[PDB]
From a paper:
The IM component [name] comprises an ATP-binding cassette (ABC) transporter, which powers the transport of [name] across the bridge. The cytoplasmic LptB dimer binds and hydrolyses ATP and the transmembrane (TM) domains of [name] and LptG create a cavity to accommodate [name]. LptB2 constitutes the cytoplasmic NBD dimer and the six TM helices of [name] and LptG (F_TM1-TM6 and G_TM1-TM6) constitute two TMDs that are arranged to form a central cavity with two surface gaps between TM1F and TM5G and TM1G and TM5F termed as lateral gates. To understand the mechanisms of how [name] recognises and acts to transport [name], we obtained high-resolution cryo-electron microscopy (cryo-EM) structures of [name] complexed with substrate [name] or ATP analogue β-γ-imidoadenosine 5′-triphosphate (AMP-[name]).
We also obtained cryo-EM structure of [name] complexed with [name] to compare the conformational changes with and without the presence of LptC. In this study, we used cryo-EM to resolve an [name]-bound structure of sfLptB2FG at overall 3.7 Å resolution with TM domain at 3.2 Å resolution. The cryo-EM maps of sfLptB2FG show clear side chain densities in the nucleotide-binding domains (NBDs) and the two transmembrane domains (TMDs), allowing us to unambiguously fit models of NBDs and TMDs of [name]. The densities for the periplasmic domains of [name] and LptG are at low resolution but are clearly visible. The cryo-EM structure reveals a clear [name] density in the central cavity, showing all six acyl tails, glucosamine disaccharide phosphorylated at 1′ and 4′ positions, and the inner core oligosaccharide. The [name] molecule trapped is a natural substrate of sfLptB2FG that was overexpressed in the E. coli C43(DE3) strain. The acyl tails of [name] are drooped and perpendicular to the IM plane in the upper cavity and the inner core positioned above in the periplasmic space. In the cavity, hydrophobic residues I25, F26, L62, L66, L70 and M303 of [name] and L26, I33, I66, F67, I313, F317 and Y320 of LptG interact with the [name] acyl tails via van der Waals interactions. Charged residues K34, K62, R133 and R136 of LptG and R33 of [name] form salt bonds with the 1′-phosphate group of [name], while K40 of LptG and K317 of [name] form salt bonds with the 4′-phosphate group of [name]. D37 of LptG interacts with the glucosamine disaccharide of lipid A. K322, R263 and Q248 of [name] and K41 of LptG interact with the inner core oligosaccharide.
Residue numbers in the entry:
A (entry chain B): 2 to 239
B (entry chain F): 2 to 133, 247 to 353
C (entry chain G): 3 to 140, 250 to 262, 269 to 360
D (entry chain A): 2 to 240
């Protein structure tokens, strides 16, 4: 599908944080939304998800206006969110919290819940953890479950929030692998973070927003060639 | 499942406040009982056992309060670990937060009603049986239909407040990271204090007779109940 | 001697003590106010206890709320300096831990000189007319020689008022040992809950185990000193434990 | 002088997070202390500073053992700590922060502090702001006043804690130009951050630990060509 976000704006106590950004994502495509910490990148991402209500703007998921909806109604029509910090259900087993989301999708029968939950433990290599509770997993084991249950809501365009967040460079070779896995199932990923040496390697096109308006967009080999981004961000990168 | 996770998690924090708020009330009931024992009746006797007959009277406040304080401590704990923001980012509504605060409130209501019907009377009949018309404390729940200051309403307004304080916590236990975690209770804790200051100063001020549940005791119970609905249904057009 | 850190680490503790005490006496004013108009109707609308219980009973309430708002502001103000990481960087510049202790105690000298100032002149003079302005419509000098007009329960009441300023200086000592004790960058929520727990335990230990000592048998002068000395020993044991 | 550490060991509950780590920093020399998270690289750093008490170590500056000493007495031997947070005194002006720690030193006479303070505000090009408080300075004065204040206590081995720690890649040139300037005044410095792309581009030596102990202690061109560190750490491509 063709999630389109046109003319996003916001006012925090008179201050203007974002004005007229236009970012789209198609299915099977990783787009990045990055920039300097001037409000910019952060508040624009929290409107496509929906925790921050917009001032004036129009979000459509490929046919229909969803811009006046909360986050929880947007999760029915597609969009699936991943928080930055640890958000696994702490006192529940891995199979239980993978099922506690799977109990809500009402286009399944009760014997289709158990096949689909078993199809997700085999896919993400969590069949050896089907009785272990939360708060007893590692940063590469808990992160697998956090995607394996946010994929159980049948989403389109999972959009992750800082999924590097401080981790050693041996454990980004598999965070990039489960992200390139989601492109090969037809889900357009929207990544946004601080770690700019990695998302320019995984993305197909980025959206650098800075000081309000969107300043450039396109393929990451056109980003480093551009001179206008180079004054605010990525000084002498490579 | 996600309702059975919420009920099982608040209950371990509701059956823990019930033995923490008990010591606060036991000691406070023991401060006032020493003033009538260092100068009142001779304390070679009841001071332990008279305190044990005050527990179904002090249970009229700590049973609605332990559910009110229990839903603040758990929902405050689950927002800051980003478990409720991820609860309804994968598809469910705020109704599962409300349908978990009432299936628990039904449990505490039938303990509050069993406390206020034929358990408070049972001890107050026996409290004066160890010191050996217008009673309104020994009087059982059926024969509260007689005359002027029948306070059947303060025996019925604390079964309603078990249900209604369960509805004011699920929109007020949202925590803003700007204000922090302990400052996002003072909107809710002060609102609970404003309820029992009016409910008490309309019972004793209205028992001798100035204003009674005709235009004053059940309108504060209903401006404060309709507040619990407009604060809970904010996700629509303004009216 | 009164540097810049000495006039900054001892100033935030002075406001947060003085503006907690205002927030505790106003909350103990309102829920005393609505207690005192469920009695009105006898020739006194704002006169029984409603209106004129604001200068006539409030100096009584800055004496029974003063110790547990001295454990508190030295925990909620000093814990603020440890939350935004200004207490580890004072030590990382040379300002030692026994100089933090020396500078919170210099704040206490305006505190304990104020409490026995209005614990002798203002609090009983206010509280005496707080009953006369009610009964019409229905100290140390003044309480020393009354011990011989008996010929017990009152000698405990006098002797628990002379070193009541000592109860203030021990609370900032206990609130200082908690910051150098279980600190762990523990969040501000717990420092609120360990400020009410030992604050409420002080109110119980002052009014239960004060008279309970006297009823069994004791001199009354040590039963008054029990709620402060048992909180001086807890602070002393907590200081000499992590080394 | 030199700051050397000898055979550190630390065990909280059963598991030994640190097992026999040793390092040596000289004057005028950046040296990193790197590694994966939880491998002791934040525990063997804080043992050098003195926040966590060591168990079986021996921290030595040129001719004095300081391993038994706490942090406040270690800061007078010439050790400066800079935490990874704001750490500016908020309600105290930017002149007073460089004055509140200049009054700690006793070998400075009362007039000799002001010309030293005006020297420090001129050296780091922060003279133009003198009365701004500190609650509102910048993201770029929350990092330059901290160095110009922790340099005021006359250090010899200033120990940074996560200098980069989430800033813009245009600000990694301005918070690197003043780290190489910090060693130009004859002052060894020990970076221990997480983001391993610029600590290897600023230093001359490293001390990568893994789960209890050292793995390699060469220059960055003896680490990227190493084979043992490329399995528990960086990976298979770092060109
Ligand atoms: C987890 C976190 C949350 C925790 C929350 C914990 C909550 C715990 C709560 C515990 C308590 C619950 C109580 C309750 O259950 O909930 C109630 C409802 C509200 C509940 C709310 C709960 C939820 C809150 C939720 C918050 C959010 C979560 C309240 C209550 O209880 O309300 C009332 C109560 N309230 C309070 O105290 C406030 C309460 C409120 C509750 C607590 C709130 C806490 C909030 C905390 C959180 C805040 C968050 C923001 O807090 C306190 O307690 C504080 C306790 C410590 C608290 C610590 C808190 C923090 C803990 C933290 C722990 C970790 C009130 O007290 C009043 C004051 O007392 C002392 O003053 P003084 O010392 O004196 O100055 C105090 N000194 C102190 O406290 C000392 C303290 O050290 C001070 C404070 C210390 C603070 C320590 C702090 C530690 C801090 C630590 C660090 C923080 C004052 O302190 C104050 O202000 C306190 C001050 O503000 C401070 C407050 C607290 C501040 C806290 C700040 C916290 C800060 C941090 C947090 C922010 C205090 O205000 O008394 C009322 C009852 O009194 C009466 C009545 O009015 O009816 C009259 C009584 O007699 C007297 C009198 O004593 O004065 C003398 C009489 O002579 C007469 O003069 C009379 C009137 O004048 C007359 O006009 O008055 C007596 O009479 C009867 O017995 C007498 C005798 O036998 C025995 O005495 C007889 O005498 P006699 O016969 O002569 O012998 C009488 O005879 C007369 O009358 C007869 C009849 O007429 C009678 O009538 C019948 O017959 C008629 C027919 O005959 C004809 O028709 C009928 O018509 C009638 O209908 C009827 O049937 C005649 O008969 P006839 O012959 O004519 O026939 C006869 O002849 C004659 O005339 C009569 O028989 C009586 C009896 O009870 C029942 O019979 O009834 C109670 O009403 P009640 O409710 O109705 O009971
Ligand atoms: C410039 C400081 C101005 C302080 C003004 C305080 C006005 C409120 C005063 C009161 C308060 C802060 C309450 C939480 C919110 C503020 C938290 C602020 C954290 C700042 C870092 C300080 C303490 O709450 C109190 O609760 C009672 C029962 O629990 C405790 O016993 C107290 O002992 C205390 O806990
Ligand atoms: C009698 C002495 C008792 C001392 C108690 C010390 C522990 C007290 C707090 C620990 C219990 C958990 O309590 C909760 O902690 C969180 C952790 O952020 C705080 O936040 C909450 O406000 C508090 O409700
Ligand atoms: C809300 C203001 C008072 C807070 C008091 C402390 C609440 C946390 C401690 C009580 C508690 C205990 C003892 C406890 O043992 C427990 O065990 C599983 C809890 O689980 C959720 C608890 O909440
Ligand atoms: C003894 C009279 C005063 C009792 C005050 C309440 C004590 C129980 C509640 C506080 C508490 C909380 C909230 C708590 O979280 C906790 O956690 C480990 C405690 O541990 C010992 C506590 O005591």
């Amino acid at each position: 599908a063709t999630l389109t976000a046109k003319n996003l704006a916001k006012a925090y106590k008179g201050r203007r944080v974002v004005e007229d950004v236009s970012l789209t994502v198609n299915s099977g495509e990783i787009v990045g939304l990055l920039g300097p910490n001037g409000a910019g990148k952060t508040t624009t991402f929290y409107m496509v998800v929906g925790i921050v209500p917009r001032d004036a703007g129009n979000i459509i998921i490929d046919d229909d206006d969803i811009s006046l909806l909360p986050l929880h109604a947007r999760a029915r029509r597609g969009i699936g969110y991943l928080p930055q910090e640890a958000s696994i259900f702490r006192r529940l087993s891995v199979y239980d919290n993978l099922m506690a989301v799977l109990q809500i999708r009402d286009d399944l029968s009760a014997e289709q819940r158990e096949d689909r939950a078993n199809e997700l433990m085999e896919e993400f290599h969590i069949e050896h953890l089907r009785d272990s509770m939360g708060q007893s997993l590692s940063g590469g084991e808990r992160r697998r479950v956090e995607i394996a249950r946010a994929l159980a809501a049948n989403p389109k365009f999972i959009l992750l929030d800082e999924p590097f967040a401080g981790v050693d460079p041996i454990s980004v070779i598999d965070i990039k692998r489960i992200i390139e896995h989601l492109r090969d199932s037809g889900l357009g990923v929207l990544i946004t973070d601080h770690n700019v040496r990695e998302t320019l390697a995984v993305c197909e096109r980025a959206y650098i927003v800075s000081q309000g308006h969107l300043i450039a967009h396109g393929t990451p080999t056109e980003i480093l060639q551009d001179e206008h981004v180079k004054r605010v961000y990525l000084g002498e990168d490579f | 499942i996600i309702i059975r996770y919420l009920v099982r998690e608040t209950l371990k924090s509701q059956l823990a406040i019930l033995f923490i708020l008990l010591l606060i009330f036991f000691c406070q009931k023991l401060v006032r009982i020493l003033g009538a024992a260092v100068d009142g009746d001779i304390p070679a006797n009841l001071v332990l056992s008279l305190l044990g007959l005050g527990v179904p009277e002090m249970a009229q406040l700590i049973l609605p309060l332990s559910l009110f304080l229990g839903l603040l401590m758990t929902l405050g704990k689950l927002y800051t670990e980003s478990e409720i923001t991820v609860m309804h980012a994968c598809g469910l509504s705020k109704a599962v937060l409300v349908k978990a605060a009432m299936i628990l409130a039904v449990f505490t209501a039938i303990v509050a009603a069993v406390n206020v019907m034929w358990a408070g009377p049972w001890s107050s009949r026996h409290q004066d049986e160890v010191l050996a018309d217008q009673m309104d404390m020994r009087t059982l729940w059926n024969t509260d239909t007689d005359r002027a200051r029948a306070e059947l309403n303060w025996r019925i307004t604390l079964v309603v407040t078990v249900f209604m304080m369960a509805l004011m916590v699920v929109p007020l236990s949202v925590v803003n990271p700007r204000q922090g975690r302990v400052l996002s209770m003072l909107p809710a804790m002060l609102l609970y204090l404003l309820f029992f200051l009016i409910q008490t100063s309309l019972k004793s001020n209205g028992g001798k007779g100035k204003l009674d549940p005709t235009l004053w005791m059940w309108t504060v119970n209903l401006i404060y109940l309709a507040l619990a609905i407009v604060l809970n249904l904010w996700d629509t057009v303004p009216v | 001697p009164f540097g810049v850190l000495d006039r900054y680490i001892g100033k935030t503790i002075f406001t947060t003590i003085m503006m907690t005490l205002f927030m505790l006496v106003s909350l103990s004013g309102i829920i005393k106010f609505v207690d005192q108009l469920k009695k009105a109707g006898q020739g006194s609308y704002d006169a029984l206890g409603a209106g004129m219980y604001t200068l006539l009973s409030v100096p009584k309430d800055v004496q029974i709320f003063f110790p547990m708002a001295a454990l508190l502001g030295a925990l909620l103000g000093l814990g603020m300096l440890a939350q935004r990481s200004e207490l580890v960087v004072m030590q990382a510049s040379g300002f030692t831990r026994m100089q933090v202790a020396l500078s919170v105690m210099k704040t206490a000298i305006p505190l304990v000189l104020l409490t026995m100032a209005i614990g002798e002149w203002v609090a009983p003079q206010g509280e005496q007319m707080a009953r006369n302005y009610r009964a019409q419509a229905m100290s140390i000098s003044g309480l020393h020689n009354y011990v011989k007009y008996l010929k017990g329960r009152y000698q405990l009441n006098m002797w628990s008022k002379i070193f009541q300023p000592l109860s203030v200086a021990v609370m900032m000592l206990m609130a200082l040992s908690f910051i150098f004790g279980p600190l762990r960058s523990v969040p501000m929520g717990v420092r609120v809950v360990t400020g009410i727990s030992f604050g409420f335990v002080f109110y119980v230990l002052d009014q239960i185990f004060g008279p309970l000592t006297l009823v069994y048998g004791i001199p009354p002068i040590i039963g008054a000193l029990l709620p402060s000395a048992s909180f001086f020993l807890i602070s002393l044991w907590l200081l000499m434990r992590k080394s």
